[PDB]
Amino acid sequence: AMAFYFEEPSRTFSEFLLVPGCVPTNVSLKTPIVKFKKGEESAITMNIPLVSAIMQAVSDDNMGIALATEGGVSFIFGSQSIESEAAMVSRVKNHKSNKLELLDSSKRYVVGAGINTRDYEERVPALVEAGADILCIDSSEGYSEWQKRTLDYVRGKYGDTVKVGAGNVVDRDGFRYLAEAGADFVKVGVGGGSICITRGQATALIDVAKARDEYFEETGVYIPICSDGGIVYDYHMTLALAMGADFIMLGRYFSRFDESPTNKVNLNGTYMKEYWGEGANRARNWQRYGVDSYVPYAGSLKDNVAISLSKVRSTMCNCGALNIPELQQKAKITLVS
Amino acid sequence: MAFYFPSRTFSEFLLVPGYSSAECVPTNVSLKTPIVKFKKGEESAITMNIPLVSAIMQAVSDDNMGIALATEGGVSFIFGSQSIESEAAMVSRVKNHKSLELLDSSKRYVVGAGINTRDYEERVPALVEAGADILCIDSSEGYSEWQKRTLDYVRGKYGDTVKVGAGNVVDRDGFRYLAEAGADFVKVGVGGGSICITREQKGIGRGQATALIDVAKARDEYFEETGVYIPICSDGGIVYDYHMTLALAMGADFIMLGRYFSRFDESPTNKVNLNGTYMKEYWGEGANRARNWQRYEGVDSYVPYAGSLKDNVAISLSKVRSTMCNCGALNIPELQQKAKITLVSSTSIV
Amino acid sequence: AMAFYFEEPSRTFSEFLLVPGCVPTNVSLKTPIVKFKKGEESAITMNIPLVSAIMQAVSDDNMGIALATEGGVSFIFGSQSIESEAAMVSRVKNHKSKLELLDSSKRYVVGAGINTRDYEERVPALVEAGADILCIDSSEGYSEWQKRTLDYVRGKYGDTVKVGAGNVVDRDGFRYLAEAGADFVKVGVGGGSICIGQATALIDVAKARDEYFEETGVYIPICSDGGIVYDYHMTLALAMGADFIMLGRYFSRFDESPTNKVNLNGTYMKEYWGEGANRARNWQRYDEGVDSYVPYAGSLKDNVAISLSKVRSTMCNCGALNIPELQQKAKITLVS
Amino acid sequence: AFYFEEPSRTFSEFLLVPCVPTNVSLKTPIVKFKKGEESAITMNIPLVSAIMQAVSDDNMGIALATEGGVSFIFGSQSIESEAAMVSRVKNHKLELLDSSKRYVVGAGINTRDYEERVPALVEAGADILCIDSSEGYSEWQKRTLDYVRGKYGDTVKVGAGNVVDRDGFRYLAEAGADFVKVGVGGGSICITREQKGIGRGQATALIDVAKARDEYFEETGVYIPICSDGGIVYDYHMTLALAMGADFIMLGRYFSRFDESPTNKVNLNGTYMKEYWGEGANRARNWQRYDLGGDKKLSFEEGVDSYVPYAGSLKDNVAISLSKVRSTMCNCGALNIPELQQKAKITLVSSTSIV
Amino acid sequence: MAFYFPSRTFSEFLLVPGVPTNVSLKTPIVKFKKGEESAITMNIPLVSAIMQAVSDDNMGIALATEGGVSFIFGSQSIESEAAMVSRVKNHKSKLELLDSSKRYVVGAGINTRDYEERVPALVEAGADILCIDSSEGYSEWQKRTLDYVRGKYGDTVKVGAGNVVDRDGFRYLAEAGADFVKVGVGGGSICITREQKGIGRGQATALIDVAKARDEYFEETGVYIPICSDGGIVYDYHMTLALAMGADFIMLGRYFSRFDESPTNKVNLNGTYMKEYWGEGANRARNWQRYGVDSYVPYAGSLKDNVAISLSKVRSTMCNCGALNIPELQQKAKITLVSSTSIV
Numbered sequence A: 001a002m003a004f005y006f007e008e009p010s011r012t013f014s015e016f017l018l019v020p021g022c023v024p025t026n027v028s029l030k031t032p033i034v035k036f037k038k039g040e041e042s043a044i045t046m047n048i049p050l051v052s053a054i055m056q057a058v059s060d061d062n063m064g065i066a067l068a069t070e071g072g073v074s075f076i077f078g079s080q081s082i083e084s085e086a087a088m089v090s091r092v093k094n095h096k097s098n099k100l101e102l103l104d105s106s107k108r109y110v111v112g113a114g115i116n117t118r119d120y121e122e123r124v125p126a127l128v129e130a131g132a133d134i135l136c137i138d139s140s141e142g143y144s145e146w147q148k149r150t151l152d153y154v155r156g157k158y159g160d161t162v163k164v165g166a167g168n169v170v171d172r173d174g175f176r177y178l179a180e181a182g183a184d185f186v187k188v189g190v191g192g193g194s195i196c197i198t199r200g201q202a203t204a205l206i207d208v209a210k211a212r213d214e215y216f217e218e219t220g221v222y223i224p225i226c227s228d229g230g231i232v233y234d235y236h237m238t239l240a241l242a243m244g245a246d247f248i249m250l251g252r253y254f255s256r257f258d259e260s261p262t263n264k265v266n267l268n269g270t271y272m273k274e275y276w277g278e279g280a281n282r283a284r285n286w287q288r289y290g291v292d293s294y295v296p297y298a299g300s301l302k303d304n305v306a307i308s309l310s311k312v313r314s315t316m317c318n319c320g321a322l323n324i325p326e327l328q329q330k331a332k333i334t335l336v337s
Numbered sequence B: 001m002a003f004y005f006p007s008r009t010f011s012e013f014l015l016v017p018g019y020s021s022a023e024c025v026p027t028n029v030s031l032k033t034p035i036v037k038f039k040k041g042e043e044s045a046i047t048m049n050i051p052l053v054s055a056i057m058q059a060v061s062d063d064n065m066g067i068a069l070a071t072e073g074g075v076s077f078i079f080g081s082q083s084i085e086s087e088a089a090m091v092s093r094v095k096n097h098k099s100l101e102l103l104d105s106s107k108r109y110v111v112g113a114g115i116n117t118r119d120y121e122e123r124v125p126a127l128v129e130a131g132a133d134i135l136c137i138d139s140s141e142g143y144s145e146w147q148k149r150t151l152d153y154v155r156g157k158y159g160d161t162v163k164v165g166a167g168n169v170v171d172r173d174g175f176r177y178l179a180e181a182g183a184d185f186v187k188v189g190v191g192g193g194s195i196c197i198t199r200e201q202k203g204i205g206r207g208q209a210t211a212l213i214d215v216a217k218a219r220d221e222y223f224e225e226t227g228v229y230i231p232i233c234s235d236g237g238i239v240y241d242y243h244m245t246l247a248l249a250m251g252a253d254f255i256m257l258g259r260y261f262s263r264f265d266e267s268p269t270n271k272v273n274l275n276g277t278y279m280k281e282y283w284g285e286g287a288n289r290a291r292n293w294q295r296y297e298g299v300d301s302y303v304p305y306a307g308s309l310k311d312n313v314a315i316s317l318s319k320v321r322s323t324m325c326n327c328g329a330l331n332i333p334e335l336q337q338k339a340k341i342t343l344v345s346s347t348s349i350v
Numbered sequence C: 001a002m003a004f005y006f007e008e009p010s011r012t013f014s015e016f017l018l019v020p021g022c023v024p025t026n027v028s029l030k031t032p033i034v035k036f037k038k039g040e041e042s043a044i045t046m047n048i049p050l051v052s053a054i055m056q057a058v059s060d061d062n063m064g065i066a067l068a069t070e071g072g073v074s075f076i077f078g079s080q081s082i083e084s085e086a087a088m089v090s091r092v093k094n095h096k097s098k099l100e101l102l103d104s105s106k107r108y109v110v111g112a113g114i115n116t117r118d119y120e121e122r123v124p125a126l127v128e129a130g131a132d133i134l135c136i137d138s139s140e141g142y143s144e145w146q147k148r149t150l151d152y153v154r155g156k157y158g159d160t161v162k163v164g165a166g167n168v169v170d171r172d173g174f175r176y177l178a179e180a181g182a183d184f185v186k187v188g189v190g191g192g193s194i195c196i197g198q199a200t201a202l203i204d205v206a207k208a209r210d211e212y213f214e215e216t217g218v219y220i221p222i223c224s225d226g227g228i229v230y231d232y233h234m235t236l237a238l239a240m241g242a243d244f245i246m247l248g249r250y251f252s253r254f255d256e257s258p259t260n261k262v263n264l265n266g267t268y269m270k271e272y273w274g275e276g277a278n279r280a281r282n283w284q285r286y287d288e289g290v291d292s293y294v295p296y297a298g299s300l301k302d303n304v305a306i307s308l309s310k311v312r313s314t315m316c317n318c319g320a321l322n323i324p325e326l327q328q329k330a331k332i333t334l335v336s
Numbered sequence D: 001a002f003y004f005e006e007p008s009r010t011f012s013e014f015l016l017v018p019c020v021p022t023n024v025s026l027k028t029p030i031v032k033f034k035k036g037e038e039s040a041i042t043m044n045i046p047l048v049s050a051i052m053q054a055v056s057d058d059n060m061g062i063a064l065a066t067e068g069g070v071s072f073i074f075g076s077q078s079i080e081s082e083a084a085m086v087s088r089v090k091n092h093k094l095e096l097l098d099s100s101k102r103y104v105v106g107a108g109i110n111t112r113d114y115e116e117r118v119p120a121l122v123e124a125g126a127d128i129l130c131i132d133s134s135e136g137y138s139e140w141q142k143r144t145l146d147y148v149r150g151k152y153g154d155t156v157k158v159g160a161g162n163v164v165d166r167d168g169f170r171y172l173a174e175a176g177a178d179f180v181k182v183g184v185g186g187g188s189i190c191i192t193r194e195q196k197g198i199g200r201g202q203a204t205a206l207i208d209v210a211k212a213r214d215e216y217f218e219e220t221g222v223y224i225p226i227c228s229d230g231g232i233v234y235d236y237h238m239t240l241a242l243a244m245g246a247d248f249i250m251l252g253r254y255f256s257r258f259d260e261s262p263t264n265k266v267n268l269n270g271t272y273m274k275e276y277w278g279e280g281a282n283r284a285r286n287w288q289r290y291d292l293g294g295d296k297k298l299s300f301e302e303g304v305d306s307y308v309p310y311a312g313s314l315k316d317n318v319a320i321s322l323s324k325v326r327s328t329m330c331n332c333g334a335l336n337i338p339e340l341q342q343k344a345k346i347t348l349v350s351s352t353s354i355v
Numbered sequence E: 001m002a003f004y005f006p007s008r009t010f011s012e013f014l015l016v017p018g019v020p021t022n023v024s025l026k027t028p029i030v031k032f033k034k035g036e037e038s039a040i041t042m043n044i045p046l047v048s049a050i051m052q053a054v055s056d057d058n059m060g061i062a063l064a065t066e067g068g069v070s071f072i073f074g075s076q077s078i079e080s081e082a083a084m085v086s087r088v089k090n091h092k093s094k095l096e097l098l099d100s101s102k103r104y105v106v107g108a109g110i111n112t113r114d115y116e117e118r119v120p121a122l123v124e125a126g127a128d129i130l131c132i133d134s135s136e137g138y139s140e141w142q143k144r145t146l147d148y149v150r151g152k153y154g155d156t157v158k159v160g161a162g163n164v165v166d167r168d169g170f171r172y173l174a175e176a177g178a179d180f181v182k183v184g185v186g187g188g189s190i191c192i193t194r195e196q197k198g199i200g201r202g203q204a205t206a207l208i209d210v211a212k213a214r215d216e217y218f219e220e221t222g223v224y225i226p227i228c229s230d231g232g233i234v235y236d237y238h239m240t241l242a243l244a245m246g247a248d249f250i251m252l253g254r255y256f257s258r259f260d261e262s263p264t265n266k267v268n269l270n271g272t273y274m275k276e277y278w279g280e281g282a283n284r285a286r287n288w289q290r291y292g293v294d295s296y297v298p299y300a301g302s303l304k305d306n307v308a309i310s311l312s313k314v315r316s317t318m319c320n321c322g323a324l325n326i327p328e329l330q331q332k333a334k335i336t337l338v339s340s341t342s343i344v
Ligand SMILES: O=c1[nH]cnc2c1ncn2[C@@H]1O[C@H](COP(=O)(O)O)[C@@H](O)[C@H]1O
Pocket: A053, A054, A055, A189, A191, A192, A193, A194, A195, A196, A197, A228, A229, A230, A231, A249, A250, A251, A252, A253, A276, A277, A278, A279, A280
């Protein structure tokens, strides 16, 4: 009466370690987020490799202005009305422009917007009109087919004039299916979308990074990878970049800040902030209009990001790497017992 | 510096035997149950002879499984992770297969069919034209507005002639949402204790009964307001017969099983010899082969081989009827009324 | 060959959380400890909801003076001779003396623990020494003998002597001591000289107490005995139905505690032992046995000031200016 | 915060390092005796039943006496009810009989109403008494043993407990106890509400008290019989307990499984089970509120603490258990209990594994 | 704070399927070049360990009738071991492993200390194969021991070495001229210390990694060095998994210590017959020059009865994979990881 299960082994970022082998302020954290051919330059280059998650608790217009000021991009959450998301995008695009400020060709704050695989025919034109610099399908591993239909719609109507990412995927088949559908980048994570959650983020990132590099040799097209979720400590960021991720999406990290849209609460003499995932009914069933957890209040986004990126820049110096591609080439990543 | 916001399994519960000294014959125990909603005092439109249905899975419910389970009085829900044409062909193959047995008006077998929240506008008519007796929304995210829009579509076109169930839910909000949307029966995510169906499935026979008790409490509360009884389906996590009796006693009207049925000859998977012992291949609906059926090796697990469905179901229900005699119940409604369910803190070998 | 056990589920304080929905110094921490009728005023109202345990390692005359100064009551331990306990009670009532808890004669309020054995000689001696309130230091398994001590006090003194009883964990245990005339009911798993779930027991008795409050109109205050690990557990117990809290290890860490201060690996600690230890259960043999050590925390004044300031701060977030307001407005959720 | 605890080990972690089993003498004393002299009461088998409402009544006392053991009628009842149970065993007409050739029975007493319960049980014909305390050895057990030695001297034999240490043994010994009970079942001197699992007794307290008993016998020349209280169901644990120094073993849930137990038999899904509850339960602890059979109005949620598997008759099971106890003694090279305690090579099993 | 720089057992692996009498359990012991035959070829892929409690002269004869070779333990005097090797090689002869003289093939263990006087006495007594029993793993003293035999006997005397767990360990003993390489599967480590692991709890990770290094060394030099899985196996399925993972033959200690031919005493442990046992890490083995029971293993009867049972299931398992000999199993077997096993 025995049953055998054959699940592939997965690991987290805490099971690995960057082994070092000289000015930390001389390290460039610029990274691409739009696919580019060999030798060419990406259409959108961030100044820091941080993006905020596509969640009601993370990415509003206040978060988008703050993160763009530091060199990142916020992906405004799409579990709201089409008019609200476009209005949120429009407020970032019109807030007047911090040496690492990320601006477009018209000197406006760069911002992203999340879309779903359902109302994209009405949602994409409104977000494009609002000035969204880049889009990202906010889905999970098991909805890859409907991510492909959404990418096909964008490419059929806009060609390559609208930048759109897709995710999440965890393996080669998921990466290649979105890659050949025209995804300008690919998000890697065990969650995403309105699916409920329960890491395996390191294994997922390593597997997709191997398929991405293989896809680069096969086609000459470099597709940036976004590691979505699983960053608990600042040394995990450098580890994710070294494993192949070109930028990192974080939710809980940004929900702690002043610019986060959730409420600040005093919980036993310690200031905390409300938090919930997109699997919550208030997010999954936003059309019908409840706290999942609390995260500790951390202060301003600028103060925390500068601390996190100083650790990243100083770690890359110890590895003899002055930029992210150089880190991905010289990094020694070993297991920790 | 971080805080989150309990569940129990069927292994933690026990039925206290009734006080009666009168002898109870297990063969006189009736296992009939309703599967579609009905008003207070009226008879359900569909009544199964046994409280077992097969899951909406590629590795469980094909046409052969549909004929075998209908012969024993149950209903199979043909899986919908396939083309609309191949699903209607499997539905028609069970209906047109010539015929205790669960039959419709035309003495044909009773079969079910799963639907999704995307192509229902063209899949629901094809399945009804194929002769499906009851439908069920197979959702991977739980109760959502897309389950509602699918339910609104069926009601707006067929009224109440076509019966469609929906799920999964675990709490009162989920039940009342699908109940107020017109669902004929509500499915409870017992196997994983969650509303979603994702690639990582829970172990065999490790279902969570807490979700079933919570929805049964909302169903009885809802039945007391509107006078409408919504049949509850306990979905997954059960293989042991005593867990079937517990599920029924806790308020479940019928039980959906996947891995329980994949062990049988009529399962559509391949039988393999694993060092003498016969085994059966298996994979969940969250696997890439099912989730990406439009794009078309692929073995998630080996389940033990258990022979024929007729032999195994007869043994499982022989113990269910015997357990209901010990509780003093001759039918499932009596079980839900007379069951003294206690919580077991621990067990021990002597 | 299986055996089946049917133990009731029991949760600790660490599994619950107070969710908020005001100046902290405006919060009143006063609370009753003697039963009062619907709308009446209790015979003894503490200024802070803290009382010290009935233990050799906790409540002596120095503890009673220090805790009464802050507004609490110490229950002098009864695992000793009748003269020794009465002398310590007398030492507190005769200490000369803003939130100070005083009786009608401007004397420090103190309690005293009695057992279910020598009460016929110990109760009058404690009454004569000036004990403002008594408490039967027992456990769940001695409810009958807790009643007989209550039946003795009520028979000889009526309601002129206030006496509480504990511990109980159930509805059936609360009503038994309530009918016997207990002025308050102590809730806890331990208690007495037995050897050693506090949240579940507190929620259960609070329901039985509230139900008993509608049947009779008499409000019997509840004392949560033991299980307070952190300062935010205090506001949790109060919001769950407890009117005051009994702490043992919390108080033995202070200077005013009678235990020896000990340097242990550079960290100053203090000795500690429970009433189930031989030195306490069999005090008659004694007219060394250290069960555990607790960290030396400093003065009772400075620590109680910090613990209550957090309590007052949490109640402000919950929109409660007093303990009764807290027990009505508090939103308590389960926390994994 | 640092705390103090001693390493405790169960019976399953010990092993006896290695004859006709029928010739083995399972006889053992249960009352103290001076060096060289015999014992007043010599059981034929080393088993006694627990002073519990769910174990020892008149039927249990009769059946266990026919097999050579003694039952201790529970005191969690009226003095009249316990005296009637003791009297029914005596006046009921191998077997363990007294001088009058009546069944030998024991009775439990508490430290509260001993001035009326002890005379009533002695009048009823109790051959031996035992103090049941929920708090462990205390001054109230001393005052109870002082009263018995004052009114009856040594005519009435009384045991006390439970203990887990040297000081506890010497306290009841210097108080005049005829035998001393070791809190093996829960590893504690107390009998509280929650109970340990079936067969999870702590041998550490038995070994520590056996060392104190052997040292007390070396000074005064008085041998105090030791009782291992509970925590044993397996036959090998019985031989282990006897080997570690226990002169006789008291079992609760071992005897509750039998038909001679006063609890209800229940058909649970085709398997016969018996209701069970410990002496820490309110029905036993608050027995003064159900004095005339008020406990049969209690429901399953209120009255039944546990389901134990029905094991049939006492005589059938004890014969199976003792037949293997006698066979285990053969592998150790011992024909009697005293020889076991001197020849037993007891070792610690660091681990067991399947091959 | 104290960062430290992952192994799986045989229980976590499963052979994915694609006449058991037709199956050949023959396997080589000694090195050979691509194309030629092996100097010593087994009939069954089982050897007994180099331990006081497993390999006497009785075990050498019994394992020789069934087709295996026993390595006589070297924790004894040089004359005592030589007399044990002599008795097996002088005991008169269906699957027996015999030399050209039609005498029983037997092995003997040596150490890196007295080899200059112990190796001659063992070869002089007729030991076919030798094996270095090391306590620290692969080291220089194992290389100099190998340099001694190759300098005095050339390649006439065959000597194996171990234990290794890694690629560097295999290549070190390979370049040093070892005839076979032994892998520390039982303890998953390079050493053989006091505390031994559990029966049947061997680590397959060391066997896979060394087989990867053995196949690389074979493709670069054309010299096949047989691999030995040393310990941690009593289950027949773990034998087939080890053979499929690259191991050519398996070394077992507690598996053979349970049989009547074991040198230990048979005891009656409460109606159940048991066998005494102790590892080479015990003082009675490591302090054999100065001159009790570490464990009780279950008595299983005779070697012939149980070994025939284990190998009949090994042949039956090899049929379910589609392999008729051990080389074919190493090429056709599909080995997968079992995330978990559940009971229905
Ligand atoms: O409720 C959920 N449903 C689905 N995905 C989630 C949920 N919560 C978090 N995630 C995923 O985890 C990410 C958050 O990363 P983190 O909070 O920094 O660990 C999101 O961007 C999603 O990809």
